[PDB]
Amino acid sequence: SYDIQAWKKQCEELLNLIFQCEDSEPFRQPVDLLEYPDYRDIIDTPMDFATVRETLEAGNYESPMELCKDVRLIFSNSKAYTPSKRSRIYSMSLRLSAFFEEHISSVLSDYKSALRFHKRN
Ligand SMILES: O=C(NCC1CC1)N1CCN(C(=O)c2ccc(Cl)c(Cl)c2)CC1
């Protein structure tokens, strides 16, 4: 399975599955700074799933590793901003993360395999 471009549609499909999940709702759009007025005192680089999807569709990811780094930032931001490890929003973030890690692993493996095959000779 040595298609170097296949990761892009596979990531589009996985983002569709995350957007169809209730646990994504706090992460679909940038954190509301009126709701959380100290957010940028804690978080240096905001990230959300609409920004990831727009970056993918603009053709501004070169690899699925770059998309994976941004999605992981969504989760690390939630962990850094949470006042408690028991908080609702953080709790939702950990379920999304396990689902994401479960499905992204084949996308990364297949892409890296395809690039090694391209450089085989
Ligand atoms: O659009 C969907 N299905 C399309 C299929 C043709 C029917 N979805 C998206 C969400 N689904 C998950 O698998 C899921 C489960 C747990 C978590 Cl945490 C997350 Cl993020 C996602 C199933 C329903």
Boundaries of every domain in the chain: 1-121
Nominal resolution in Å?
1.2
Distance 13 CA to ligand 1 centre (A): 10
How many CB atoms are located within 10 Å of the residue 77 CB?
21
Q: Find out whether 64 and 104 touch, Cβ atoms under 8 Å.
A: yes
Q: Which residues line ligand 1 (CB under 6 A)?
A: 17-18, 20-21, 23-24, 95-96, 99
Angle at 104 (CA atoms; ends 58, 121), nearest 5 degrees = 85
Q: How many residues does the chain have?
A: 121
Give the Cα separation of 67 and 107 in Å (integer): 11
Instruction: Give the method of determination.
Output: X-ray
Give the Cα separation of 57 and 52 in Å (integer): 9
Among residues 92, 96, 74, the alpha carbon closest in space to that of 29 is found at 74
Q: Which amino acid is at 61?
A: Y
